[PDB]
């Protein structure tokens, strides 16, 4: 079984996996919309209640069943919990991952794509009213994807953007054939310190803007103020929850599957604690001090609110290119953005990917040339039902990404510091840690997260059926190579 060659690298790999393009696409808008510093503020407490518990919770499961050869849940929940069910459960941890990558692997295409378009200068050229230079770039995005012109809920991607999307899936492939250590970590100790180097230049341009209309400091401080009234409002405690579980990677069965790679006697409080940290601080400070600060610098307050309120995708393609485009080398910059976006994506693609590829070797017995190859084929067979049919990234996203992640996340945390024990889960969490775990954190595992997580769940076109029918199905395929795995 593979493991990982040096703990630095295996803390560059983990931020990889945490860090990506949530954190600089969902994140400003998810805290604009909520307020700004009143997001923040449960945001955080979301992090100490909820992040860091389930990370640990993730990093240790995962280590204990690779000490076991199995890196995928349908077999780390029936270590866990002997029961038909839990591999049903299970089943969960590698539906969500494959599911989520089949179309952030195409997101990850759009950046690549609009990262290749910047460099060459191919951008559209608005004249010297906002309107004027926001439809030139907002058209540059329809093309490229095939946004419907009519009724009919029909994609019609630009043949660059199916190219790209080639390349793209042939990166993964090129990066996941190579194995743990020399692929994921020797890839990740370089795209690491690009995308914070990335991220650090352009966090200072943005910071430099100023209009008549504000400045990036205004921002930062709509960002940054905390605002107590609205701590009452459930739904900034949802939004921050599944903000965490977004940023986090937590209940995508990725992080599970890369600790299986750590070695039984290696260290996992310090390591995840250390990556936890790494995704905060590249999230928190990085990427929320880019978007928001230039949309307030140049519209103010409460029009970057109402550009965040219009989307992830219309402010991460549209609104910032627009935006930099008035600025002296602003297509560089551009490209600079979208280049980071790029690195943020492969890393964690990537680690969403190796998932299925752990099963077919684990459990199927696979090769890794034949795991990577054939997880490569149904994840870019199955893109092209959100490269083609509207809204299809939608319903993936809601069910895989979003109900899906939570209720696993419960899910994981009940199997493991209920059903597997509490004591037994502590001592294996704490089991050659450099630093140990504060004691309180246990009375946090075992009661306040699953009672946190389950208050927040119960107060939280035809076409779309197409999608659903479609995942439903690949869950059925999944559960059956499980079957299989079992008469094996
Ligand atoms: C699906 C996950 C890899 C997402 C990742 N946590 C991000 O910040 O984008
Ligand atoms: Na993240
Ligand atoms: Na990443």
Not at 10 to 28: E, T
Not at 88 to 108: D, K, N, R, T
Not at 305 to 326: C, D, M, Y
Not at 363 to 390: C, D, G, P, Q, Y
């Amino acid at each position: 079984r593979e493991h990982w060659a040096t703990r630095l690298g295996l803390i560059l790999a983990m931020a990889g996996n945490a860090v990506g393009l949530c954190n600089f696409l969902r994140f400003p808008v998810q805290a604009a919309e909520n307020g700004g510093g009143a997001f923040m503020i449960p945001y955080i407490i979301a992090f100490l209640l909820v992040g860091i518990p389930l990370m640990w919770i993730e990093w240790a499961m995962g280590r204990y069943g690779g000490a076991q050869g199995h890196g995928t849940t349908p077999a780390i929940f029936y270590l866990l919990w002997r029961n038909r069910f839990a591999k049903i459960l299970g089943v969960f941890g590698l539906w969500i991952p494959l599911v989520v990558a089949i179309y952030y692997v195409y997101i990850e295409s759009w950046t690549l794509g609009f990262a290749i378009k910047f460099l060459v200068g191919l951008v559209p050229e608005p004249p010297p009213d906002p309107d004027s230079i926001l439809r030139p770039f907002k058209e540059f995005l329809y093309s490229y994807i095939g946004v419907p012109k009519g009724d009919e809920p029909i994609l019609k991607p630009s043949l660059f953007a199916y190219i790209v999307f080639l390349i793209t899936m042939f990166i993964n492939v090129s990066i996941l054939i190579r194995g743990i250590s020399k692929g994921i970590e020797r890839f990740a100790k370089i795209a690491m310190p690009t995308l914070f180097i990335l991220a650090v230049f352009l966090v200072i341009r943005v910071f430099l803007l100023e209009t008549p209309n504000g400045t990036a400091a205004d921002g930062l401080n709509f960002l940054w103020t905390p605002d107590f009234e609205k701590l009452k409002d459930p739904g900034v405690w949802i939004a921050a929850v599944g903000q965490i579980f977004f940023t986090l990677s937590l209940g995508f069965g990725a992080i599970i599957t890369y600790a299986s790679y750590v070695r039984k006697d290696q260290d996992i409080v310090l390591s995840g604690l250390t990556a936890a940290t790494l995704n905060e601080k590249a999230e928190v400070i990085l990427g929320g001090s880019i978007s928001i600060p230039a949309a307030v610098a140049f519209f103010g307050v409460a029009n970057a609110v109402a550009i965040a309120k219009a989307g992830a995708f219309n402010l991460g393609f549209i609104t910032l290119p627009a935006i930099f485009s008035q600025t002296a080398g602003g297509t560089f910059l551009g490209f600079l953005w979208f280049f980071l976006l790029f690195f943020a994506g492969l890393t964690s693609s990537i680690a969403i990917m190796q998932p299925m590829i752990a099963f077919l070797e684990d459990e199927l017995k696979l090769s890794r040339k034949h795991a990577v190859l054939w997880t490569a084929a149904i994840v870019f067979f199955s893109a092209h039902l959100v490269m083609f049919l509207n809204k299809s990234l939608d319903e993936m996203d809601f069910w895989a990404g979003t109900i899906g992640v939570v209720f696993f996340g419960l899910t994981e945390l009940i199997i493991f510091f209920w059903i597997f024990g509490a004591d037994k889960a502590w001592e294996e969490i704490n089991r050659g840690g450099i630093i140990k775990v504060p004691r309180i954190y246990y009375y946090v595992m075992r009661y306040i997260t699953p009672a946190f997580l389950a208050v927040l769940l119960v107060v939280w076109h035809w076409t779309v059926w197409i999608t659903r029918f479609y995942i439903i199905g690949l869950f059925l395929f999944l559960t059956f190579l499980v079957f299989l795995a079992e008469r094996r």
